[PDB]
Design a protein around this ligand. Structure first.
Ligand SMILES: CCCCCCCC
Lengths: 48, 38, 54, 38, 38
């Protein structure tokens, strides 16, 4: 439950965690993953 | 000039993002319906 | 064994009180609370470093 | 004419709304982090 | 020609819709504050 509620706002995922638990263990378990103002506003929205 | 191209690109990105979100939400609702049927 | 059980029940009661306080802190938003500057300087800079939270 | 001014004002208001939403989300996440530290 | 007018109407509609959402969120937050005071 602690691992499940993790976000970039509080935690960083180690590379080894990513590699292990998104490549090997999932495979070993037989579970496979599937005007200036206007343009400034539009750019801010896209970036957001 | 470049402002118009950036604006069009941003609008297209917004439209694509909402389309993808709608598709995801629809698949989730299909799963909820399957659970309801069971 | 009874002494240990008593001590642990006191600790668990304290933990329940602390968990109520932690939950109250967790569900705070600008619409209802304002974060005091001391809260920032302490809980987001100093104490996290002491605890290796980064 | 008036259509352009209305469109620009609406785009600006949408931008301001999104910035306010980001600010509020950031403060909420600060409170969550404080609880995690405690 | 009509496309620009349709886009202006859509932008106005989006802005009005987000204004409405903001008003509703404000009222909900007022009710939450009332509960906390009680
Ligand atoms: C061109 C304005 C788009 C605003 C989208 C907002 C989605 C929450």
């Amino acid at each position: 439950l602690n691992v499940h509620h993790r976000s970039p706002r509080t935690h960083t995922m180690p590379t080894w965690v990513r590699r292990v638990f998104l490549d090997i263990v999932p495979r070993l378990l037989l579970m496979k993953r599937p005007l200036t103002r206007a343009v400034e506003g539009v750019q801010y929205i896209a970036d957001h | 000039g470049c402002g118009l191209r950036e604006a069009v690109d941003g609008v297209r990105f917004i439209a694509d993002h909402m389309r993808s979100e709608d598709d995801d939400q629809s698949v989730s609702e299909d799963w909820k319906y399957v659970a309801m049927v069971i | 064994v009874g002494k240990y059980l008593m001590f642990t029940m006191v600790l668990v009661t304290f933990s329940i009180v602390t968990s109520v306080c932690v939950l109250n802190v967790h569900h705070r938003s600008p619409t209802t609370h304002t974060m005091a500057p001391w809260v920032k300087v302490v809980f987001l800079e100093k104490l996290p470093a002491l605890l290796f939270m980064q």
